[PDB]
């Protein structure tokens, strides 16, 4: 069969993908592009309106001396210019991040004990339902106790709510189902049983604060906002004194003792509070992505949906804006979720492994790393050599390094069932690639690459960590594009091959199994395409409170 990227290459160029030569300089520069033309016209209008020059195609060098390409969003039939995959220009991408940033998971296990033990009152599915009615009024920013309170406009905050989940089927089934993430409905049977056993009789809230607030404020707002309205709702629903010593136990539990943040805070040089992208460990990112519960018979699809999730968040929004900005890093990321290229390479490796070892049946050792990561690396690099259109597509060495190594690392983890040997395979891929083509990535690409092999299995203080626990704040990883989202994919890979319901945190997995989210986490690449086409509807807009 055709390689999976052939359709996309045929769409981009007039030549067949194998053709070695072309003609440049005859496309009219920016004028070849619908999108650049839109931008030129908009820049003229903006400049005139505000009295300050802005976008101008004659500044600096003239874009479009070559073909300005369309990109296929992988697993879709949507082809767009790359500007439509810039996070600024794509409301789906922005909403994906808002939906993570504005979420916290907050236990009820201490709260219910305070109620039963310190106050001496009962807790049942009926009282929990009454509490959930209360907190779904309060959480978006509405009052339950005081006189003369002024409140948020319900339509501005329609995206904010609270659901619960629990491993106890009897409680889950009796709470009003409007408020329940039903583990049995959302997950296939095997996964549901795993997840219910992890949660047990615990009861957890999934709290989503308003997008408009998250955008006005920051990620570290989320757990505070959550806790304030949990606290008010405990007071109201359980008929408590409105501020007694026990109130502080609900606060400490909701803010500290029983809260799960999406991200942990960052060191000062990159100072940020909780629920920012740099604090989100790779295992959590894999668990946020919901591909695992839909596409579980295809571990490649699951792994690469996680790669798309992370490449966008970590390279485009986090490294490309929070940590830098400007034009940023769209195509460093798109390489990992367009043109079915990473898909081609990773299906090749999965078949290699399936045929030679069986998934998860290879020895978890360096022999397997050397075998699989080498074989898949050579396959991927051969494709760039055999298809000049492919090499002109993924024109930056970094893009190619990330894609080839992601396939190699995921494939290695498919063989071993262990993410750490997957990670070793990622670094071996880089070393081989570098020697094959006498190049790798941008000036600073392989900082982590060269520390990489030695730090995979290290146990020292700021070196040793299982991959699932690493993240964008792991020291070697803190700076550079073309790694973080791919590591999230490698973290997912062995778990997808094993059929595991989650990678690192079962509560995080369950917390995004929810169709009341604005973004559809089951189909990340489909959503990026919908946003590119300007067909995604985000939360948080202010049209209701601005003029017609």
């Amino acid at each position: 069969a055709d390689k999976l990227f052939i359709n996309a290459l045929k769409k981009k160029f007039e030549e067949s993908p194998e053709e070695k030569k072309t003609t440049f300089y005859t496309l009219g520069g920016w004028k070849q592009s619908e999108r650049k033309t839109e931008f030129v016209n908009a820049g003229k209008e903006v400049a005139a309106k505000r009295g300050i020059p802005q976008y101008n195609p004659d500044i600096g060098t003239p874009l479009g001396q070559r073909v300005l390409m369309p990109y296929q969003v992988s697993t879709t039939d949507t082809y767009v210019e790359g500007d439509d995959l810039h996070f600024v220009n794509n409301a789906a991408m922005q909403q994906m991040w808002d939906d993570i940033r504005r979420t916290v998971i907050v236990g009820l296990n201490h709260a219910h004990a305070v109620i039963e033990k310190r106050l001496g009152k009962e807790v049942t599915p009926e009282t929990i339902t009454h509490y959930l009615e209360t907190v779904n009024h309060a959480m978006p920013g509405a009052a339950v106790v005081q006189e003369h309170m002024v409140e948020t406009h319900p339509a501005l905050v329609a995206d904010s709510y609270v659901k619960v989940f629990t491993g106890n089927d009897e409680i889950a089934d009796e709470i009003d189902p409007a408020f329940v993430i039903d583990i049995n409905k959302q997950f296939p049977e095997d996964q549901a049983e795993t997840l219910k056993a992890e949660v047990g009789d615990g009861i957890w809230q999934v709290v989503r604060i308003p997008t408009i607030v998250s955008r006005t404020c920051d990620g570290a707002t989320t757990s505070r906002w959550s806790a304030m309205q949990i606290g008010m709702s405990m007071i109201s629903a359980y008929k408590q004194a409105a501020g007694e010593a026990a109130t502080g136990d609900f606060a400490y539990a909701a803010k500290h003792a029983e809260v799960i943040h999406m991200g942990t805070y960052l060191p000062v040089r990159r100072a940020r509070g909780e629920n920012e992208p740099g604090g989100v460990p790779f295992g959590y990112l894999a668990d946020i992505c919901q591909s695992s519960r839909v596409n579980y018979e295809d571990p490649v699809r699951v792994s690469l949906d996680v790669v798309a999730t992370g490449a966008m968040l970590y390279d485009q929004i986090w490294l490309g804006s929070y940590m830098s900005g400007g034009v940023g890093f769209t195509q460093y990321a798109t390489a990992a979720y367009t043109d079915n290229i990473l898909d081609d390479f990773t299906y090749f490796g999965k078949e290699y492994v399936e045929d030679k070892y069986g998934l998860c049946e290879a020895p978890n050792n360096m022999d397997t790393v050397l075998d699989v990561a080498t074989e898949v690396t050579f396959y991927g690099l051969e494709q760039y050599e055999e298809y000049p259109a492919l090499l002109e597509d993924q024109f930056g060495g970094s893009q190619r390094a990330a894609v080839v190594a992601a396939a190699a690392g995921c494939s290695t983890a498919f063989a071993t069932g262990n993410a750490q040997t997957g990670l070793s395979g990622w670094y071996l891929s880089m070393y081989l690639h570098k020697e094959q083509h006498s190049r790798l990535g941008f000036y600073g690409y392989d900082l982590q690459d060269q520390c990489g092999a030695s730090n995979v299995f290290s146990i020292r203080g700021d070196e040793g960590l299982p991959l699932e626990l690493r993240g964008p704040n792991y020291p070697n990883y803190a700076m550079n594009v073309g790694h973080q989202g791919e590591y999230a994919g490698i973290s997912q890979a062995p778990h997808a091959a094993r059929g595991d319901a989650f990678v690192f945190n079962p509560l995080v997995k369950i917390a995004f199994a929810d169709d009341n989210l604005v973004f559809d986490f089951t189909n990340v690449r489909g959503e990026f395409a919908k946003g590119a086409l300007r067909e995604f509807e985000p939360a948080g807009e202010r049209a209701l409170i601005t003029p017609a």
């Binding site: 799960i260 960590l465 299982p466 626990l469 778990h495 595991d500 945190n505």
Partner: protein, 442 residues
């Protein structure tokens, strides 16, 4: 020598130990037992071997509710604790006869570790204690069972948690009374970031010992912060002596006189009487049926008032056997005494202010918690320069079981290990004995 003041020192039964000890014999800068306590708290680590073993067996590493399926390792750590601890000790020590201690507790489930003092003498700060201890136990466990290169990273995760992705040792199975340097509210704050429950745990809820340990840590921080330099030094030393060391038996005697039937108000009345009898305050002016008191020694008035504040906490929260009202005592002892006398309250209003916010943040939705989770580094309770938190320690020591976030809930690992250390458990004893020993060298 610098100050002329002398104080009489007592034990926690109210019995005289040594008369007329120079004030500076109690200074953190001079007293060798305070030095030993502070270096001990820098260097001591609790290791939960059972916890490490269970985290490995279940692959539950990296923080609350986290687990990595397929990574489970079943190692007989507690059954081989003697060998593992001895191997760890060989790495932790500098030389074979130094002051390194590694002691198993609970049938090998826990270890007390005291990292050698010499490592801290050539260190900037105190993180060598958890970091040296952690890697010595990670290596000792790997070596005990010949854990492979492929699996050893799980042992590291079980010991130290999600660090360095997290800034903290998130999910770790070691504990210290100190917390990481990044969490300091300001430079010099590290001896303040010690949970009240940890102090109460280490001192086995002995009220005077808890108050003493807390005061020693708070007032030693005041020296590190520069607050007890120059003009303020005597104020801080007198506060340490009278509020935390029961100087002149003043706290003890106020509690004795008010314990049966007394209130915050009756303690105030007795303290004002005692300040007047001792010549600390004097009537300055007469208004209409109201005496305005003055003082020629504001630092000594402050110290007397601070002793009364401690006694009022002991009487009020002691009578309830419930800690929560310490926020109220800290507020209204100070509010009342100002309108009773015309003199400023303890720490010139800063205890009262601390108490206002502490009351709010222990009875509201917005943050805080129960008394035991506060500390001198907490944003709510950092404002008084040593004169509030020791009362919170006393109140939690006196709590008979009214708190959800009790020392039993928050500080069990700390309790088991740190209460073993005599100078941590009974600091009043050792600091008074050391003061007596150096009394003629001041």
């Amino acid at each position: 020598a610098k100050f002329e003041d002398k104080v009489d020192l007592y034990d926690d039964r109210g019995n005289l130990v040594e008369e007329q000890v120079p004030l500076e014999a109690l200074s953190p800068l001079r007293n060798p037992a305070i030095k030993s306590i502070v270096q001990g708290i820098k260097r001591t680590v609790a290791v939960n071997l059972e916890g490490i073993e269970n985290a490995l067996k279940t692959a539950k590493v990296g923080g609350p509710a986290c687990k990595i399926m397929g990574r489970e390792l079943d190692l007989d750590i507690v059954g081989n604790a003697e060998s593992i601890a001895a191997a760890a000790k060989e790495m932790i020590q500098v030389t074979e006869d130094d002051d390194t201690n590694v002691e198993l507790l609970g049938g090998g489930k826990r270890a007390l570790v005291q990292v050698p003092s010499a490592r801290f003498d050539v260190a900037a700060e105190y993180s060598a204690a958890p970091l040296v201890t952690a890697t010595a136990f990670v290596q000792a466990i790997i070596n005990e069972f010949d854990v492979s290169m492929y699996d050893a990273n799980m042992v590291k995760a079980a010991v130290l948690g999600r660090y360095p992705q997290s800034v903290e040792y998130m999910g770790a199975n070691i504990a210290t009374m100190l917390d990481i340097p990044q969490k300091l509210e300001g430079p010099g704050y590290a001896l303040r970031n010690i949970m009240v429950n940890h102090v109460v745990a280490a001192t086995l809820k002995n009220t005077l010992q808890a108050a003493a340990l807390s005061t020693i840590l708070e007032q030693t921080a005041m020296f590190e912060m520069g607050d007890a330099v120059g003009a303020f030094e005597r104020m801080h030393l007198l506060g340490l002596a009278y509020q935390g060391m029961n100087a002149d038996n003043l706290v003890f005697d106020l509690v004795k006189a008010n314990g049966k039937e007394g209130t915050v108000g009756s303690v105030i009345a007795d303290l004002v009487e005692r300040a007047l009898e001792d010549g600390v305050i004097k009537v300055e002016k007469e208004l209409t049926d109201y005496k305005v008191y003055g003082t020629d020694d504001l630092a000594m008035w402050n110290a007397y008032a601070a002793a009364g504040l401690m006694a009022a906490t002991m009487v009020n929260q002691g009578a309830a056997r419930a800690a929560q009202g310490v926020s109220s005592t800290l507020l209204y002892y100070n509010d009342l005494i100002e309108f009773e006398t015309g003199l400023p309250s303890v720490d010139f209003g800063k205890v009262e202010g601390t108490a206002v916010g502490f009351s709010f943040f222990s009875h509201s939705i917005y943050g805080g918690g129960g008394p035991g989770i506060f500390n001198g580094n907490h944003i709510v309770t950092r404002h008084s320069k040593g004169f509030a938190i020791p009362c919170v320690a006393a109140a939690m020591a006196l709590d008979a079981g009214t708190q959800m976030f009790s020392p039993e809930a928050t500080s069990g690992l700390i309790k088991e290990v740190f209460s073993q250390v005599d100078e941590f458990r009974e600091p009043l004893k050792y600091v008074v004995e050391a003061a007596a020993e150096i009394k003629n060298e001041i």
